[PDB]
Amino acid sequence: AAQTNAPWGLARISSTSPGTSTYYYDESAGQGSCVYVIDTGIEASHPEFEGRAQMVKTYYYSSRDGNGHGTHCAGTVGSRTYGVAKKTQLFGVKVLDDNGSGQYSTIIAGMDFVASDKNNRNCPKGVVASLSLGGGYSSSVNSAAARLQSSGVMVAVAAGNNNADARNYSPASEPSVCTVGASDRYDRRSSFSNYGSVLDIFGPGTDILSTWIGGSTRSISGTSMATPHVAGLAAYLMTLGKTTAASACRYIADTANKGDLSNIPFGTVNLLAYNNYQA
């Protein structure tokens, strides 16, 4: 399949070079897979989701997204126009409030919820979780992310936006999950992106167009925007039978575009997520 005039980030994940505007992908498009978006919620009624999104859990007075951040991340995973995996099922878990903040105990409860809740859903091709959040180092937060991965879920997490070594942030610093940095349309590391030996991969993170609350759209930047490109790619590859939840991070790194990014500090991987689709 071919999507003309796509957002730059979708075109980049299906290309060997920067500067193109068509997204190429196998028409199976993640059907039969599931992606949990653990964030501020999802506006499931947005026309871009076509009935494939629903809220499954909240820790606050409402399950609605009063912020917009979680709706934007879900759109990069699986909306019709702005998503990587256009036929996946999306499940929302609201662990952040409408100001975008949340206690670490609530975030841990949310990750334990997904590890059990997958047994109540129909996901024959496999299960993914997208975590666009983070804070300072916590051994308890890292252990929760490791349990979720062990249970058979592909876990993707944001590196953080401090222009620093990701070793000092959680869940970014957990070894067994997929830690994602951010790049821009000219193949530079984003100026805010964290780095270090704990990173596994980079994805598009500067000026990313996706869905917003109120049935609208907008372009915003961060490692939060890079993370759902990788979660959507994992769902797409599991549907095609190329990999499984336990080895998807290794498969994505083995098949990535190598040595193409600028301003990568010595010691950090120079790997950009790529679907390797041949029309």
Cβ-based neighbours of 130, under 8 Å, separated by 6 or more: 35, 36, 37, 38, 39, 73, 77, 156, 227, 228, 231
User: Cα(211)–Cα(252) distance, rounded to whole angstroms?
Assistant: 26
The CATH number of the domain holding residue 213 is: 3.40.50.200
Q: How many whole angstroms separate alpha carbon 90 and alpha carbon 129?
A: 10
DSSP 8-state class, residue 165: B
175 is in an annotated binding site: yes
- CA distances to 53, 107, 121, 152, 168 from 114, in Å: 16, 11, 11, 11, 25
Start-to-end CA span in the chain (Å):
8
Cβ atoms 76, 48 nearer than 8 A: no
- Expressed in percent and rounded to 5, the helix, strand and coil fractions of the chain are 25, 25, 50
Resolution of this PDB entry, in A? 1.5
* Cβ atoms of residues 226 and 205 within 8 Å: yes
Q: What is the dihedral of CA 113, 114, 119, 120, to 10 degrees?
A: 80
Q: Are strands 257-258 and 271-272 parallel, antiparallel or unpaired?
A: antiparallel
Cis previous bond, 171, omega within 30: yes
CB atoms within 10 A of CB 221: 17
| Contact between 203 and 226 (Cβ < 8 Å) | yes
Residue 213 CB contacts under 8 Å (≥ 6 apart), including other chains: 43, 65, 66, 67, 68, 71
- DSSP run (H or E) holding 277: none
**Structural domain tally of the chain?**
1
Spatial contact of 35 and 65, defined as CB atoms under 8 Å apart: no
Q: Which residues contact 223 (CB under 8 A, 6 or more apart)?
A: 132, 158, 159, 160, 161, 180, 181, 182, 190, 192, 193, 194, 205
DSSP letters for 122-163: --TTEEEEEE---EE--HHHHHHHHHHHHTT-EEEEE--SSS
Q: Which of 267, 259, 253 is nearest to 187 (CA)?
A: 259
Q: Which residues are catalytic?
A: 39, 69, 224
Residue type, 104: Y
Task: Indicate the Cα dihedral angle 95, 97, 98, 99, nearest 10°.
Answer: -120
Length of the chain: 279
Tokens 């126009």, residue located: 81
Whether residue 40 is annotated as binding a ligand: the answer is: no
- Cα dihedral 180, 56, 245, 248 sign: negative
The sign of the CA dihedral 82, 14, 232, 34 is: positive
Strand partners, 54: 91
Breaks (C–N over 2.5 Å) after residues, the chain: none
Residues 200, 195: Cα–Cα separation, whole Å: 10
CA separation (Å) from 236 to 68, 107, 127, 128, 161? 25, 26, 11, 10, 27
Amino acid at position 144, single letter: A
Q: Which of 91, 87, 49, 84 is nearest to 208 (CA)?
A: 84
Q: Looking at the DSSP assignment, which residues form a beta bridge with residue 135?
A: 170
Domain region containing 240: 1-279
47 annotated as ligand-binding: no
Please name the residues in contact with 191: beta carbons below 8 A apart, sequence gap of 6 or more.
Answer: 163
